[PDB]
Amino acid sequence: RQNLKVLLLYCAFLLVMLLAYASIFRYLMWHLEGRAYSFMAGIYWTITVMTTLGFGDITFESDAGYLFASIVTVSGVIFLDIILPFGFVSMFLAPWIERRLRYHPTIELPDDTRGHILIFGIDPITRTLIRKLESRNHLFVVVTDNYDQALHLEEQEGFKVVYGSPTDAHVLAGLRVAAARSIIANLSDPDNANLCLTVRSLCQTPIIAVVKEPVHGELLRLAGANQVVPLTRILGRYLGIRATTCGALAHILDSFGNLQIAELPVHGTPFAGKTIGESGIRQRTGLSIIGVWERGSLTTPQRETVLTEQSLLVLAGTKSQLAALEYLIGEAPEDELIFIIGHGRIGCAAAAFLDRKPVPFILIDRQESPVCNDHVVVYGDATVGQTLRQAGIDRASGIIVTTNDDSTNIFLTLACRHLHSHIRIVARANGEENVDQLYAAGADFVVSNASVGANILGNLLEHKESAFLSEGMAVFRRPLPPAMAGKTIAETRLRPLTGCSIVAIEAPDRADILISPPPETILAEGARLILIGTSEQEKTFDQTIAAR
Amino acid sequence: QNLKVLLLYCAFLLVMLLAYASIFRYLMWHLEGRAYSFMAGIYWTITVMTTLGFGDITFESDAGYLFASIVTVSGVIFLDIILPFGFVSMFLAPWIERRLRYHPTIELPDDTRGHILIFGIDPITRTLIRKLESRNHLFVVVTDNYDQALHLEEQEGFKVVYGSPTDAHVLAGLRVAAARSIIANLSDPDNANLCLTVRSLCQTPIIAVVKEPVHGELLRLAGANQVVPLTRILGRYLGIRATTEDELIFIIGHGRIGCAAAAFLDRKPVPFILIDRQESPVCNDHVVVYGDATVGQTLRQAGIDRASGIIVTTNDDSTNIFLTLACRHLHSHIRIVARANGEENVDQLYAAGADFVVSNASVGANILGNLLEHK
Amino acid sequence: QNLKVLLLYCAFLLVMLLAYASIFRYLMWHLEGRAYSFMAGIYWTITVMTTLGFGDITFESDAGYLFASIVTVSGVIFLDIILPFGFVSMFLAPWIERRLRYHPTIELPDDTRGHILIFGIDPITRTLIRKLESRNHLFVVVTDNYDQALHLEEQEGFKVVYGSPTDAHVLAGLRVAAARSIIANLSDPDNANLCLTVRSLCQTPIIAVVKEPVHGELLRLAGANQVVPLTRILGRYLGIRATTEDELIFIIGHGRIGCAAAAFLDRKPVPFILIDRQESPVCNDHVVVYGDATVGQTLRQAGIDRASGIIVTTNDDSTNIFLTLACRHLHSHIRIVARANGEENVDQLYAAGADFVVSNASVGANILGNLLEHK
Amino acid sequence: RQNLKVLLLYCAFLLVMLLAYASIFRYLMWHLEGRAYSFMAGIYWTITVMTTLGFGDITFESDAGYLFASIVTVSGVIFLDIILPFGFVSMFLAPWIERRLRYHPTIELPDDTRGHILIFGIDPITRTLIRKLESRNHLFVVVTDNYDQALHLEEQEGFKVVYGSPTDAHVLAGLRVAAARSIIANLSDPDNANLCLTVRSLCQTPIIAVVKEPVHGELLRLAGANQVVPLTRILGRYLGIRATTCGALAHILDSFGNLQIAELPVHGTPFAGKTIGESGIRQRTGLSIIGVWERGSLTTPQRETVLTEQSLLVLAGTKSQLAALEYLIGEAPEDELIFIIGHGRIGCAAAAFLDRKPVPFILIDRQESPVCNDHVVVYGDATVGQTLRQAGIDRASGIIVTTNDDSTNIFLTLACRHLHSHIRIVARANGEENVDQLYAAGADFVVSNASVGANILGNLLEHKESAFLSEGMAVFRRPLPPAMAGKTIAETRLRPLTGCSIVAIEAPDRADILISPPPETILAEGARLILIGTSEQEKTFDQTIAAR
Ligand SMILES: NC(=O)c1ccc[n+]([C@@H]2O[C@H](COP(=O)([O-])OP(=O)(O)OC[C@H]3O[C@@H](n4cnc5c(N)ncnc54)[C@H](O)[C@@H]3O)[C@@H](O)[C@H]2O)c1
Ligand SMILES: NC(=O)c1ccc[n+]([C@@H]2O[C@H](COP(=O)([O-])OP(=O)(O)OC[C@H]3O[C@@H](n4cnc5c(N)ncnc54)[C@H](O)[C@@H]3O)[C@@H](O)[C@H]2O)c1
Ligand SMILES: NC(=O)c1ccc[n+]([C@@H]2O[C@H](COP(=O)([O-])OP(=O)(O)OC[C@H]3O[C@@H](n4cnc5c(N)ncnc54)[C@H](O)[C@@H]3O)[C@@H](O)[C@H]2O)c1
Ligand SMILES: NC(=O)c1ccc[n+]([C@@H]2O[C@H](COP(=O)([O-])OP(=O)(O)OC[C@H]3O[C@@H](n4cnc5c(N)ncnc54)[C@H](O)[C@@H]3O)[C@@H](O)[C@H]2O)c1
Ligand SMILES: [Ca+2]
Ligand SMILES: [Ca+2]
Ligand SMILES: [Ca+2]
Ligand SMILES: [Ca+2]
Ligand SMILES: [K+]
Ligand SMILES: [K+]
Ligand SMILES: [K+]
Ligand SMILES: [K+]
Ligand SMILES: [K+]
Ligand SMILES: [K+]
Ligand SMILES: [Zn+2]
Ligand SMILES: [Zn+2]
Ligand SMILES: [Zn+2]
Ligand SMILES: [Zn+2]
Predict the structure, then answer these.
(1) Strand partners, B312
(2) Which of D48, D101, D407 sits opposite B189 (nearest CB)?
(3) Which of A517, B280, C161, D123 is surrounded by the most beta carbons within 10 Å?
(4) Is residue B11 classed as helix, strand or coil in its secondary structure?
(5) What angle do CA C207, C213, C219 make, to 5 degrees?
(6) Per the CB < 8 Å rule, is A411 touching C54?
(7) CATH number assigned to the domain with residue range B1-103, chosen from the 4 options 1.10.287.3510, 1.10.287.70, 3.90.180.10, 3.40.50.1950
(8) How is residue D374 annotated by DSSP?
(9) B60, A395, A131: which is closest to D57 by C-alpha?
(10) Which of D125, D219, D346 to mutate for ligand 4's pocket (most ligand atoms within 8 Å of CB)?
(11) Strands A528-533, A377-379: parallel, antiparallel or unpaired by DSSP?
């Protein structure tokens, strides 16, 4: 762009100069030597001289003619044998060499940059989040204060990289944080708090902070973070619900204090092997299966779908409906013993979850935790022989192998399954390239940090236009009033009246559900609506519909 | 600079032109009995060297052929070989040694005068530079570290010299004798070495920033004209702000500043508590409650509740900001005095809920500022 | 490779030549009633584009002038612009991306077959390469470390690929399915990961060098076709040489080899003493006399006098050589069995006074050698 | 060289091609068009075509003539517009860019390399040794196995740098160690032993090893080292002789078991302030002052020379003559107390020397020595306040400030002199750039590691042709027999008869001495000769002279 314009601007200067010299030529040939030449001849002569061809078939004879001829001759050499290669090599090659042998850090962002997503702090989580939304061509800009990292990130793109201090208000100004679509804060908790307070001093751009410690979640929202995601707490929890011999209800949300969302692993449950409509969950519980999660895919629950030992049911309903489901499972086995290998922030949260039930566990680690003081840990290297044995791995019922190193996880899953083919093995994969090999080692289930983290962050980014909306709001369930038995969503006009929105429409005697129904959906009789709105519109709901 | 070699070549070319134009007329006359003008000789010579070659004026003798061949070869060598060979080996060569492979400045120009030498760059001296740009001094920072020299070279408001600060030959190339003033911001043993070395050459005014107030006397002995104990000053500020019976002040951070704060609150005297994750390697006169403050219980354990004031003094601004948030979140009214290492974090410490913020960069640069003006 | 783009251009140029030579004759005829030969058209066209410009054959019409101008401009663009622009941006450009800034090979050519993948380069596998060069295999070493890739690139007898050994997409680009054999010389957890990943793609024979004999069974489970416990073997060798009552053997070095030596001398059984500067991070079944052996008294303290044999087993050949000298200098006849990490130090261990020398590189490469031949 | 030859070989190809085309031109012009042109015309035409000038005044008219003309035209462009710039840029610029932006390690040395000095292991010692003999233009080649060090050393030269494993026999082969003049082994003791044993497997080139531990001196000579230099032991010793309040005799050599060399510091001695001939040392001792060392200069002792508080007398004589001198000093002060700051290998040797007298000392250090177990050390940081005070620095009589850090040394010398203007301060300078500032701090004497080490190594390199000669030999002293009273050294023929050599000739009643007298020196009556020879020629000395 910038260089091309200067390139053909030079072509316009030459073409003008050509016509100039061609005209002066015809002029002088007439007024000095009494020769009349055509316009074409003038162009023909001028080109002949500049290109240094020099046929000599049209030449001057006077000194003044020699003078003009010499000038046109030098002009050609200067502007076709000197400037043209030099001008080329300086405007073209200087960028091409300097920028390719010598990393020039992107210190700023173009002023016209709008609707971009600022990523702070790169890791397998955000690394995956980028790659999964780069398939979507989202304008991603990751920032870092590490020189040796910026150029590394420049090689696999992907994305754009800005090198500067994430907390610096001036660096943020050059990042155009005001025009930003969203901001992912994945630095340490003290750094994130610094980032949020600084961003808030410039704009109100929505920030998603990935809090390094569940306690610091409150402090980050105070800093200005519109959303807070405790990964390890969630990741550890996901390691835990899978670790038990028989699956149990896992409470997710208790909004509105009457409607709850809860997930349930199907492994070890009576629902394992049967289909959804066969087990009759909604039938005996009154719940709403709002999705079946299996192998990284949230699918619409159908009666044909066969629940496997690796499934996960997303459920919604009242408080007495969840307790009705826990009754059907219904009891947990006795004398469970869960070995948790690795005592980091994830391994800790894994035990923390298993303690909220509670279930007797054992922690094994190489060193003393610098953060936790509430858990008892058996100190020892899980690789060195007899270390697991002496800890009493024999009477264990399940093992959570959660180490910061994947090859070690794979090696422990490999060894444990080799010694105890019976016990349940849950493995943790830091990188998603190691997930398959963990299953191949003998693990019954694998929790991938990167993928799980990317899904959460991603969904919070896609549903962003309704994220801070749905935040501070309460989801609710209303049985379709017999008045609208046969009316269309667009015809009913629910939103302009009440203010809420239809997120789900399920049939009377069916586990089948219609997630996010289009306005042209024709409602039926006995259907059960699941809506989302403010804790003010939920009360002005039954008010508005009955009073029109 | 490269101009002088280039237009000298143009001078030689111009001479070679007139020389060839002259011989042309002389030869044309004596060789073949032809009388050509001066412009004809210029026009002919140009036509030959530029290799245009109109052929309208050509010799017919062997002596004329030889000459023509000589002028032709000259046009090739001195326009199609040397002229481009010059180009690349005159200012495309310094282009690689200064833009493709970082070339550190190891010495200043001989005539350099009225410049300010900065030894040991930090947020304080970095701010001292951008605070005196309106006076338009020439700030030169000197570092014995290669990597630091490179980072300080891409961003600029000052000059960057790479070499041993404590070397006499390096100080000589820095033209210290012609310097306006020198700022010593290295460690105490280094500054002592820096002064004694400078004093062997010149008597340039030295403003040394001392690490321990006790060492201040020694730095004067070395040769410093002024000594600035900032952490005593910065520590004194934090202590003054924390106060202006049951009055308990928490000092979170037991470094040289935090220590100076505690040392100040002994003169009042006001009871205090020092919390740190590590035992001070320089101090053994204060009592420190050990344990990391970010973890959690330590603030509640030591009793942040019955405290009247809090002083957050960590070398990490992000940590400070985080602690200021936590304290303000726990006790919504307690006096919180925070420390700012960089001036970029001052606004966020107040946003976090601090009642007063002391900036090391601001206070530091202001003192060093008012010492370079009232020299 | 760049040839094909270059001579295609020569083909285009040749076509453009004949095209211009043809139009020339056609125009000369129809425009000005002149009949020129084919060679005249070639000769004229060349003369114009090369900008020689004899002017002996020139048009006199405007249509002829236009054409001449077009052929002239073409000679400039397609010989003085594109021809050099091609040059620089065709094989002077790969010259910078491969000789001025190290470009690591991240993938092998699609057709690559019969190659041997080496995972984890060391004096053993480095010797395995230079020991099978007469068979002319294609050895490719793979390292996830940038710096190591660069050092292994300047010196060569093998191919160097940079990337994560435990990545499926990286193994796919290494064409493991077409590989002759794979050598796993990484840590035990890594090899387990390496095998399980390879087995998901292909069933290429894997020769895994296991770190702990107990883990050998696990590596077979992972997918290895052969497992080689060298330190057990190397330790066994040292023990066999140390012997073939009051017989005391000193083992200087308590690593996995030294441990294996001690583990072997328990089966005999022959009393021994293990001397090391550090407690073994993997072993807790042997008794080690702690203290550095180079310092001095430790050899005299433990009683190197009443010993019958000495086994020097340190991961440092220079240390070994030095200890072998010291022992031979103290006791001029005592049995000294030394360990050689590299094969370059074997001769100096004997020169130092060793009675027999076991070379890790030699023994290692020979086993791995006879496993790739009798596949 | 290599590139220049290819350059003007191309000029010879062109000149031949010019003459070729010029000849074929005249040939064709005759046989094809009946035109006769001169030799000059042919050159004139051919040049005109190749250079693309193209006057057109001499042109062909036939097709065959057009064919030849076109060939010469293309030939010119290929060989003056294509090959000439390309050939240039590939033979010239490729070395100039690649070798200047990308370090190409010198892996080998040219076969014809003879009489070079191989330096192994670079440090302030060898760094100085190089710079001091690079003023002498000695062919120095330093070797290293550190990639990030080889290119650093390439920037300040000085010297040439070979990058390879010093112990590798193949790397040594490429270094041409056989043709080497000498080898300086300055690696660790285990590495040096490896180096020597390897070099000895190839050649018998003299090796000077710098042993890191005085005990390992025996083991290195066994490895093949022709010479062994314990620097710290020597450096520590030099710190010690200067530390005492009053100087004392320091025994250097006891060769032949009757002649000894010994040095003596003049500080605190009665000789301080007076001249050599005034104190009358040779007079009252019978010794031979073979040199006066002051301020880095070994000068010939003259009666005019004034001994200062910083002088050092190099002496030679029998065993009873040295004891006669210690009598003249003659006694040491009482209750001396020497504080030695820093307990490394040098600080250790300093105490080791002070214990061989003995003199009560105190050691202070930050940490426990990993090598020594014989000395008691007061653990503490000498920078932190009251640390020296509590150790009892008050009743000390002298301080040896010997730290690995010069700025610290300077800062301690500065502080100690400020608190105790009376006590003697000996300081250690790792780098010679810090020597002057140590004196400026208040030190009474400074021992520079680099300079002292360079002098020893240097003298062992210059006197190399007589180093291994004088090694294993015994220096002796013989009173000039009255028979040669008036005869010249060359006339006497001492060497061809006995086998020894005259190294010194001193006068009867004079402290003046003639070091290394020229053969034309006319001997006198009563002169005292100091010779050097084998322990076999010293006995065949008095035998040969008396029996002719
Ligand atoms: N709290 C959150 O929800 C959240 C959110 C976003 C990011 N993060 C960040 O993600 C990080 C993830 O936590 P993590 O990766 O540090 O936890 P981690 O479990 O990976 O920590 C590793 C632990 O495993 C142990 N270990 C390693 N090898 C072992 C072996 N062979 N035998 C026994 N033990 C072994 C070590 O002792 C160590 O304690 C957190 O540190 C946090 O900063 C956290
Ligand atoms: N003589 C003077 O007045 C003067 C003047 C200018 C400069 N200086 C120099 O400036 C330097 C700056 O001092 P400084 O910045 O290192 O002092 P500092 O107070 O910042 O020291 C840092 C301390 O904070 C603590 N810390 C860090 N993170 C913590 C956490 N999460 N929880 C609890 N504690 C934590 C550490 O234990 C550490 O001791 C000084 O070393 C001094 O030499 C001195
Ligand atoms: N299962 C197998 O048989 C097998 C096969 C091939 C490879 N391997 C692997 O090869 C690796 C190589 O083992 P290694 O070379 O580390 O064993 P090692 O014997 O060389 O271990 C080194 C030890 O020598 C000691 N040491 C070093 N300097 C000393 C000194 N100056 N004085 C006294 N002691 C000193 C250290 O304490 C250290 O423990 C092993 O880790 C192993 O995993 C194993
Ligand atoms: N033995 C020989 O003669 C010889 C010959 C050639 C080379 N060398 C090598 O030269 C090296 C020189 O020895 P060195 O430099 O390691 O000895 P060193 O005296 O420099 O070691 C430094 C010591 O000073 C102490 N120290 C540092 N700061 C201090 C402070 N503020 N207060 C108190 N103590 C402080 C440290 O504890 C440390 O022990 C040797 O290690 C050896 O390898 C030796
Ligand atoms: Ca894998
Ligand atoms: Ca900030
Ligand atoms: Ca060797
Ligand atoms: Ca100095
Ligand atoms: K031309
Ligand atoms: K003509
Ligand atoms: K004509
Ligand atoms: K021409
Ligand atoms: K021409
Ligand atoms: K012409
Ligand atoms: Zn815990
Ligand atoms: Zn303190
Ligand atoms: Zn063992
Ligand atoms: Zn000692």
Answers:
(1) B252, B338
(2) D407
(3) C161
(4) helix
(5) 45
(6) no
(7) 1.10.287.70
(8) S
(9) B60
(10) D346
(11) unpaired
Pair type for strands C181-184 and C206-208: parallel
Question: Residue with structure tokens 């601090």?
Answer: B354
Q: Do domains D258-335 and D467-548 have the same CATH topology?
A: yes
Q: In what order do the strands lie in the sheet with A160-163?
A: A160-163, A140-144, A117-120, A182-185, A207-209, A227-228
Write out the two tokens for D110: 């040219």
- Going across the sheet that includes D377-379, the strands are D377-379, D361-365, D338-341, D398-401, D424-429, D445-448
Q: Which CATH class is domain D1-114+244-257?
A: mainly alpha
- The CATH superfamily holding the domain A336-466 is NAD(P)-binding Rossmann-like Domain (3.40.50.720)
Asked if the D467-548 domain carries CATH number 3.30.70.1450, the reply is yes
Token pair listed for B3: 């101009």
- Residues C246-285: b if buried by 16+ CB within 10 A, e if exposed: eebbbbbbbbbbbbbbbbbbeeeebebbbbbbeebeebee
Q: Omega before A164 cis (within 30°)?
A: no
Taking the C-alpha atoms of residue D510 and residue A80, their distance in angstroms, rounded to an integer, is: 87
Place of tokens 């397998």: A124
Cβ neighbours of residue A373 closer than 8 Å, sequence gap 6 or more: B297
Task: Bin A296: left if φ > 0, else alpha if -120 < ψ < 50, else beta.
Answer: left
Query: Looking at beta carbons, which residues of chain B come within 8 Å of C53?
Result: 53
Method by which the model was determined: X-ray
* Residue stretches of the annotated binding site of B for Ca(2+): 166, 193, 197, 344-345
Q: How far apart are CA C93 and CA C85, in angstroms?
A: 11
The DSSP output letter for A398 is E
Q: Is D204 helix (H, G, I), strand (E, B) or coil?
A: coil
Give the span between the Cα atoms of B313 and B253, in whole angstroms. Answer: 5
* C81: nearest Cα among D89, A14, A88: A88
The structure tokens listed for D314 are 């190099």
Q: In this structure, how many other beta carbons lie within 10 angstroms of the beta carbon of residue A373? A: 10
Min Cα distance D419 → chain B (Å) is: 11
The answer on whether A211 is annotated among ligand-binding residues is yes
Going through A298-405 in order, the beta strands assigned E by DSSP cover 298-299, 312-317, 338-341, 361-365, 377-379, 398-401
- B104-245: CATH class: alpha beta
Domain D258-335, second-level architecture: 2-Layer Sandwich (3.30)
Q: Which residue has the tokens 């350059």?
A: D7
Q: How far is D279 from D404, CA to CA, in rounded Å? A: 39
d(CA A274, CA D280): 116
Q: Assess if CATH 3.20.20.80 describes domain D115-243.
A: no
Domain extent listing, chain C: 1-103, 104-245, 247-375
Q: How far apart are CA B212 and CA B218, in angstroms?
A: 10
Going by the annotation, the residues of the binding site of B are: 166, 193, 197, 210-211, 231-232, 254-259, 276-278, 283, 286, 292-294, 314, 339, 344-345
The beta strands (E) that lie in D361-460 are given as: 361-365, 377-379, 398-401, 424-429, 445-448
Sign of CA dihedral B40, B46, B49, B53: negative
Residue of the CA atom closest to atom 43 of ligand 4: D212
Residues B109 and B107: their CA atoms lie apart, in Å, by 7
DSSP A18-38: HHHHHHHHHHHHHHHH-----
Contacts of A147 (CB under 8 A, 6+ apart): A105, A163, B151
* Residue from D340, D395, D383, D386 nearest D364 by CA: D340
Q: How far apart are CA B274 and CA B293, in angstroms?
A: 11
